[PDB]
Design an enzyme around this catalytic site. Structure first.
Site, PDB file in Angstrom:
ATOM      1  N   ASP A 246       0.788  -1.124   0.022  1.00 50.10           N
ATOM      2  CA  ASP A 246       0.160  -0.016  -0.034  1.00 50.10           C
ATOM      3  C   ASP A 246       1.040   1.452  -0.050  1.00 50.10           C
ATOM      4  O   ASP A 246       0.537   2.040   0.802  1.00 50.10           O
ATOM      5  CB  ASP A 246      -0.909   0.094   1.153  1.00 50.10           C
ATOM      6  CG  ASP A 246      -2.076   0.867   1.222  1.00 50.10           C
ATOM      7  OD1 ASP A 246      -2.156   1.416   0.103  1.00 50.10           O
ATOM      8  OD2 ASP A 246      -2.930   1.064   2.021  1.00 50.10           O
TER       9      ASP A 246
ATOM     10  N   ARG B  77      -0.331   9.169   0.281  1.00 52.92           N
ATOM     11  CA  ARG B  77      -1.225   9.277   1.628  1.00 52.92           C
ATOM     12  C   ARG B  77      -0.688   8.435   2.564  1.00 52.92           C
ATOM     13  O   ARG B  77      -0.932   8.899   3.851  1.00 52.92           O
ATOM     14  CB  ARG B  77      -2.474   8.760   1.040  1.00 52.92           C
ATOM     15  CG  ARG B  77      -2.657   7.397   1.076  1.00 52.92           C
ATOM     16  CD  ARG B  77      -3.885   7.081   0.436  1.00 52.92           C
ATOM     17  NE  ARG B  77      -3.947   6.235  -0.719  1.00 52.92           N
ATOM     18  CZ  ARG B  77      -3.577   5.104  -1.417  1.00 52.92           C
ATOM     19  NH1 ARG B  77      -3.367   4.187   0.018  1.00 52.92           N
ATOM     20  NH2 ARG B  77      -3.250   4.610  -2.425  1.00 52.92           N
ATOM     21  N   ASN B  78       0.336   7.458   2.416  1.00 47.79           N
ATOM     22  CA  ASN B  78       0.878   6.622   3.576  1.00 47.79           C
ATOM     23  C   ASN B  78       2.117   6.850   3.706  1.00 47.79           C
ATOM     24  O   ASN B  78       2.853   5.975   4.326  1.00 47.79           O
ATOM     25  CB  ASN B  78       0.640   5.104   3.013  1.00 47.79           C
ATOM     26  CG  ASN B  78      -0.802   4.662   3.009  1.00 47.79           C
ATOM     27  OD1 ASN B  78      -1.611   5.152   3.855  1.00 47.79           O
ATOM     28  ND2 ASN B  78      -1.256   3.584   2.373  1.00 47.79           N
TER      29      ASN B  78
ATOM     30  N   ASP C  22       1.427   3.201   7.713  1.00 43.61           N
ATOM     31  CA  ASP C  22       0.312   2.241   7.290  1.00 43.61           C
ATOM     32  C   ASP C  22       0.645   0.876   6.789  1.00 43.61           C
ATOM     33  O   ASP C  22       0.550   0.462   5.554  1.00 43.61           O
ATOM     34  CB  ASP C  22      -0.677   3.182   6.120  1.00 43.61           C
ATOM     35  CG  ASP C  22      -1.961   2.272   6.104  1.00 43.61           C
ATOM     36  OD1 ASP C  22      -2.155   1.240   6.608  1.00 43.61           O
ATOM     37  OD2 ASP C  22      -2.979   2.946   5.347  1.00 43.61           O
TER      38      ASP C  22
HETATM   39  N1  LIG Z   1       1.922   8.193  13.281  1.00 49.11           N
HETATM   40  C1  LIG Z   1       1.166   9.502  13.134  1.00 49.11           C
HETATM   41  N2  LIG Z   1       1.395  10.652  13.220  1.00 49.11           N
HETATM   42  C2  LIG Z   1       0.610  11.853  12.739  1.00 49.11           C
HETATM   43  N3  LIG Z   1      -0.397  11.597  12.308  1.00 49.11           N
HETATM   44  C3  LIG Z   1      -0.933  10.211  11.699  1.00 49.11           C
HETATM   45  C4  LIG Z   1      -0.052   9.100  12.134  1.00 49.11           C
HETATM   46  N4  LIG Z   1      -0.592   7.988  11.797  1.00 49.11           N
HETATM   47  C5  LIG Z   1      -1.824   8.392  11.115  1.00 49.11           C
HETATM   48  N5  LIG Z   1      -1.913   9.655  11.088  1.00 49.11           N
HETATM   49  C6  LIG Z   1      -3.128  10.361  10.510  1.00 49.11           C
HETATM   50  O1  LIG Z   1      -4.375   9.558  11.131  1.00 49.11           O
HETATM   51  C7  LIG Z   1      -5.294   9.518  10.053  1.00 49.11           C
HETATM   52  C8  LIG Z   1      -5.692   8.094   9.889  1.00 49.11           C
HETATM   53  O2  LIG Z   1      -4.775   7.389   9.248  1.00 49.11           O
HETATM   54  P1  LIG Z   1      -5.256   5.802   8.817  1.00 49.11           P
HETATM   55  O3  LIG Z   1      -3.776   5.080   8.611  1.00 49.11           O
HETATM   56  O4  LIG Z   1      -5.662   5.210  10.426  1.00 49.11           O
HETATM   57  O5  LIG Z   1      -6.333   5.426   8.093  1.00 49.11           O
HETATM   58  P2  LIG Z   1      -6.560   5.568   6.513  1.00 49.11           P
HETATM   59  O6  LIG Z   1      -7.862   4.976   6.179  1.00 49.11           O
HETATM   60  O7  LIG Z   1      -6.255   7.003   5.930  1.00 49.11           O
HETATM   61  C9  LIG Z   1      -5.279   4.338   5.712  1.00 49.11           C
HETATM   62  P3  LIG Z   1      -4.321   5.105   4.321  1.00 49.11           P
HETATM   63  O8  LIG Z   1      -2.898   5.184   4.923  1.00 49.11           O
HETATM   64  O9  LIG Z   1      -4.366   4.385   3.107  1.00 49.11           O
HETATM   65  O10 LIG Z   1      -4.972   6.553   4.136  1.00 49.11           O
HETATM   66  C10 LIG Z   1      -4.472  10.124   8.910  1.00 49.11           C
HETATM   67  O11 LIG Z   1      -5.230  11.269   8.896  1.00 49.11           O
HETATM   68  C11 LIG Z   1      -3.167  10.055   9.200  1.00 49.11           C
HETATM   69  O12 LIG Z   1      -2.504  10.932   8.320  1.00 49.11           O
END
Ligand SMILES: Nc1ncnc2c1ncn2[C@@H]1O[C@H](COP(=O)(O)OP(=O)(O)CP(=O)(O)O)[C@@H](O)[C@H]1O
Length: 280
Positions: free
Chosen positions: A146, A150-151, A164
């Site tokens: 993935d 965005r990841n 992710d």
């Molecule tokens: N370690 C971190 N530090 C700061 N922000 C984070 C973070 N991990 C996740 N986020 C943010 O939390 C939100 C949720 O991300 P999450 O990975 O849970 O779901 P998602 O459905 O967006 C999977 P994808 O990565 O494909 O988008 C996002 O806005 C992400 O940018």
């Protein structure tokens, strides 16, 4: 209905103070928090962390997915260009997966926000760091599955961190996959043959490169999802980003070779990007 104990990773709930929400995704939510002593070298020190947890509307699959993501992250050693697991609260309460905090959010939004601000070298640097992360992940025999802007998360000091790991798999030959992978980033062998190797991640890396040099552009713009299957089989590839040099464009195109073994390896990409960065 319980989770087995893993003392190496368990973090006491009373040392974790949950804070502001960072984002709501498909199957979970992420919140900022303060964790005291999570760095065992500095036991009284408070560290800002990110905490992944279930939402109120969680399904059974969300729970098992979150557990599986935690377990994948455990197997992945520490590296500068990946979001690393710091600890977990798994007993006597909601599952909290505690990971490194990245204050500047995801790469797609980071780049889109800096559209005319990024220098060309900054973009090449970004690409290099991500190649380094993937080289590491491949060395640990992890396929991400993935990889996409965005990841990728960006830290306060602009370090690029691959994030992710929900779809990631341990292949210590090839992982055999209705598909749950984002179509526009999938190698054709993944899309058509349900096969996944490190070289499939290289294809994804090429799409990521295109996203980076277009400052967060959407891949295959305007092409309906149902048509993309056909077009990919027939050799359709995206245009060179405006920002991009010949060298970097040829690199993307190589990542999108129809034959997986003909794509560069992450080791080769790191070597090439190091050179370009140095000469930039
Ligand atoms: N370690 C971190 N530090 C700061 N922000 C984070 C973070 N991990 C996740 N986020 C943010 O939390 C939100 C949720 O991300 P999450 O990975 O849970 O779901 P998602 O459905 O967006 C999977 P994808 O990565 O494909 O988008 C996002 O806005 C992400 O940018």
């Amino acid at each position: 209905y319980e989770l087995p104990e893993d003392p190496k990773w368990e973090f006491p709930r009373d040392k974790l103070t949950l804070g502001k929400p960072l984002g709501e995704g498909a199957f979970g939510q992420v919140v900022m928090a303060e964790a005291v002593g999570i760095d065992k070298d500095k036991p009284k020190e408070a560290v800002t962390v990110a905490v992944k947890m279930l939402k109120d509307d969680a399904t059974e699959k969300d729970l098992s997915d979150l557990v599986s993501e935690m377990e994948m992250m455990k197997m992945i050693g520490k590296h500068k260009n990946i979001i690393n697991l710091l600890g977990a609260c798994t007993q006597d309460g909601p599952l909290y997966v505690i990971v490194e905090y990245a204050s500047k959010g995801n790469l797609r939004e980071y780049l889109r926000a800096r559209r005319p601000q990024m220098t060309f070298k900054d973009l090449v640097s970004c690409t290099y760091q991500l190649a380094r992360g993937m080289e590491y992940l491949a060395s640990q025999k992890c396929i991400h599955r993935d990889l996409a802007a965005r990841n990728v998360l960006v830290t306060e000091n602009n370090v690029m961190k691959i994030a992710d790991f929900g779809l990631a798999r341990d292949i210590n030959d090839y992982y055999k996959t209705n598909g749950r992978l984002p179509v526009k980033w999938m190698a054709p062998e993944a899309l058509f043959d349900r096969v996944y190797t490190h070289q499939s991640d290289v294809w994804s890396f090429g799409v990521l490169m295109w996203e980076i040099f277009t400052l967060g552009g959407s891949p295959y713009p305007g092409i309906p999802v149902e048509e993309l299957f056909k077009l990919l089989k027939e050799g359709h590839r995206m245009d060179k980003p405006a920002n991009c040099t010949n060298e970097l464009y040829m690199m993307m195109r190589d990542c999108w070779h129809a034959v997986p073994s003909q794509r560069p390896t992450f080791k080769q990409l790191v070597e090439d990007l190091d050179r370009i960065l140095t000469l930039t």
